[PDB]
Amino acid sequence: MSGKIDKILIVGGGTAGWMAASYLGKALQGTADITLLQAPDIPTLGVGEATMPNLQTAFFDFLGIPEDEWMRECNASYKVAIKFINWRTAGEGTSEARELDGGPDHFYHPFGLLKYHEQIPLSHYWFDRLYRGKTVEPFDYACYKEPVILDANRSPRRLDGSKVTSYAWHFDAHLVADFLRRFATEKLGVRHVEDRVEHVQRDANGNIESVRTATGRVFDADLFVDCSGFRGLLINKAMEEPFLDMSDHLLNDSAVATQVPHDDDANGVEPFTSAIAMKSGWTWKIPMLGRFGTGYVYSSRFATEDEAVREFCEMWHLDPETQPLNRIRFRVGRNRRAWVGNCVSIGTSSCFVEPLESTGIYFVYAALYQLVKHFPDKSFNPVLTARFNREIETMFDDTRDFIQAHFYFSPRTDTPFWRANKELRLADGMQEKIDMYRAGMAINAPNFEEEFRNLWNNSSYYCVLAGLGLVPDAPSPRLAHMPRATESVDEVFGAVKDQQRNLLETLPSLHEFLRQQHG
Amino acid sequence: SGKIDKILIVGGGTAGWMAASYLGKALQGTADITLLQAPDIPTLGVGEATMPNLQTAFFDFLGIPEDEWMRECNASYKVAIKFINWRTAGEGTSEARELDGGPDHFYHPFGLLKYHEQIPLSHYWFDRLYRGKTVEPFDYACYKEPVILDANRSPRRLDGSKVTSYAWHFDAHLVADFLRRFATEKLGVRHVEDRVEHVQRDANGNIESVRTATGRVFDADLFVDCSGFRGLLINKAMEEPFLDMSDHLLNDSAVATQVPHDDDANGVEPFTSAIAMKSGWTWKIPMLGRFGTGYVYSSRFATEDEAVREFCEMWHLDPETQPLNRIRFRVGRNRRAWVGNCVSIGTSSCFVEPLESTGIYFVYAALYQLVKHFPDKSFNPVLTARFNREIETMFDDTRDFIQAHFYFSPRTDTPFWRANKELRLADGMQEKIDMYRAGMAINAPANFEEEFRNLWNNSSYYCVLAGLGLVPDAPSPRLAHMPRATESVDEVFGAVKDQQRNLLETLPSLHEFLRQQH
């Protein structure tokens, strides 16, 4: 009879650490004692975080915190989609879409559900019409209502509060992390120690015995949670688990970022993240209240830091000599194993990929969900660890593949960077998914375990691949056997056009809804 | 490019007419379908047991209500599989032997396992078992059905209201004939009586046409091989290898018959029986006024004569004059189910002994996957590869689940039961076993796609593994951190006892309900 875990030590007091403290503190409910160790570091600008809808259903709902409670205290805005700008046209980094085929070079990846027609996704009917010359409309404007209401900065909620589409949040992570520190220490009994790790002692099995801090205090536990960020103080340094670099799939490894004040009264608030193609990378725009966070993700093999700073500042009309800037060089990939012995990594200590599809916080609460599901006893059954590690590696490798496809299938050839992306190879499993796409199949066609497995599904692949201009070889074969379905789909498209018109005319602006929600 | 215009189905058994009906339905006059069927020596109706999605995934798709096909097929209701004598030594008998004060049986019902606080009742049951708070079997503690199956209760009240999930028992010959009439008369499928003599392949290795013994030549875009164990197209013409999987499953033979039965005097059992024998196991599939039964055995351990004797003696039949069907079968699957323009469906594709009622399921599941991956004339190869991968894991997962029935039996009393323990579990099965032993819920269960992927789930592994006596090493670790859930689960078990008691007292017998339906 081994006995349950009694003591957990979390090392790192950032977003990941305080998410871990809250999630573990809640699911356990007094069963175990949890201490979080946090070192005084130089703080960084609030450059922003873009999220996904299950931040509420999988994380805050689990904590018992309603969306209104946390959202107002963290000054969050609403995210209805990612808007991809200038991924298809040559040129310099600008916040302004270039002209492509008589219109602006952008396309949306919304959180909205893709309608099915006779059990087949509307995407397949759209391409059948495109292939047969019956349409020339872009996928996203043909198949989603959101694009035209996003073009007008509409709110996803009516003033009375009713929701007309799926949405997520834009916020400064520091504010959520402080909110969660207060919640975990004041309501869940997590003990906070402010101290710097100086020495990690391991036992004869190579497990962590204790952590000693710079003041000389010694902390032992049954389970150690590494939330120390890119340093990987426990997983990489103490435990010596290798990090698997994956820059043979993703060339971006650096960023320069700031926060820019914004006149919401004059310009309203954009209900979407922007991902703006640059000469050697892409730049995010995460709108918040009276400001937006922004960052240029670039590849040090194709632009110097000075070049990146110039390109970044010129596009927002900022003074390089006086704008406060954060610079970082990050590692791209994941640990060979996320959980080794009695040490589980959570957050960027575990894995990292550029924030092109808003996965950073998702990786934390998805791993925390998996960690509770595979929670060990004192026997630490190796199968629990093995299964956990396999969930993490497919969570990460699927996202890595999806993100590479954003660059691999961009039509641009105008800089060494954009050409270089096309000389990398896709992973075998991603090449299979592309083949499936081109054969007319619906990838992972549509509860958190289902969202976890089907994160990147047919909707996501059409949004990005057809947005960029990769489409199937021929119409999906079943459609030629469904003459009634293909003749009646006219009314489904027209239904989308109706909702576009009616929402455009009746929806308040996001600015108007956000003012009401605050004052 | 271009759609498929013509389809030839070779074989007119259960799988052939299932394929003719399903494809004919789905294509709706956008393809001409022909089925080639040769006359074969008829066999006895030894019975076929099924799963609930026969209706939801197959007959519903055809637009055929449950009442409609049941009445033409003389079908009865199946609520579970009842496993008899898998844990005690002795001869092959229809009577359960003595084990810890009760009958040596356990059930695998279709009904749903309750959850408590997001954790399956199985884990709470074992926690109590492990802490000495209970000694009740898993199925009686966690399912309402065992108690009412013991009393041969109906799954539907006389007013028709359904109280539990159920499937069907029937004679496959009658379903095949029903479907042949439906496909030819309602769906324009063309039936041709003839025997395949030659298959012409082109230089790409695809089938061009088949020539019959009357000299007729049938050409098509897509060929469906429903020829049974013979694999006339997929194995003989396309030369695709067959993967023998007798290193996981020793049974390769069966002897079967049909037994008249006085339903008015004895009632009708609302379950399939799986009765362990000295060298295999025997099915009992109740139908109306008769039951089908067969001894599945391993020729490595019993001659056909011994198997005939053991089987006839258990039913008190005359080995010398009882009408019997004898079969030898290949256990396994093709290396690839679909090669070129040739798709195999049915036993031409794969076969495993019917210990968990999958034979008809393999057909309509494969047909669902075929329509999902349906080609155009370019036969894009990823469609074929993805189809083949779905079939391969469908089968190998069933094969593993079935091997566990023999691998984890406690019996050691005959060379057969001992030899089973000397075989090796596939790596993927051993990982599932490891997971089960660590208290995890394998494929935790809740649309056929959710059903196809999670066919064998935590409910199924506990029914069989906990039934045979394999249980986890220790309670699921999460439970020690959920003291409120483990203290309140008392009333979830209590609720099961209440349904057991209430349904027992108010449900008609299966017989009584069946009488009324006619």
Ligand SMILES: Cc1cc2nc3c(=O)[nH]c(=O)nc-3n(C[C@H](O)[C@H](O)[C@H](O)COP(=O)(O)OP(=O)(O)OC[C@H]3O[C@@H](n4cnc5c(N)ncnc54)[C@H](O)[C@@H]3O)c2cc1C
């Ligand atoms: C440029 C960039 C852009 C991003 N954009 C997004 C986005 O749009 N949307 C999204 O969801 N996510 C985004 N993310 C991800 C976000 O950063 C992560 O989700 C989150 O930060 C998880 O990692 P972390 O908390 O571990 O990192 P950190 O915030 O760095 O936490 C590091 C912790 O390590 C502790 N530590 C280190 N060493 C010691 C020591 N000796 N002793 C004690 N403590 C120590 C420190 O106390 C510190 O608290 C982005 C990340 C980066 C880098």
Ligand SMILES: Cc1cc2nc3c(=O)[nH]c(=O)nc-3n(C[C@H](O)[C@H](O)[C@H](O)COP(=O)(O)OP(=O)(O)OC[C@H]3O[C@@H](n4cnc5c(N)ncnc54)[C@H](O)[C@@H]3O)c2cc1C
């Ligand atoms: C012992 C046994 C027990 C079973 N128990 C169950 C159960 O409990 N529950 C369940 O759901 N399923 C069960 N099944 C499954 C069900 O019976 C099979 O799934 C079904 O037979 C599908 O395979 P098949 O139809 O292709 O084979 P068959 O039924 O043998 O059909 C063979 C066909 O091949 C055709 N053919 C062959 N050669 C030619 C030729 N030259 N020219 C023209 N036609 C040709 C013939 O027309 C013939 O009809 C069982 C099967 C067996 C053998």
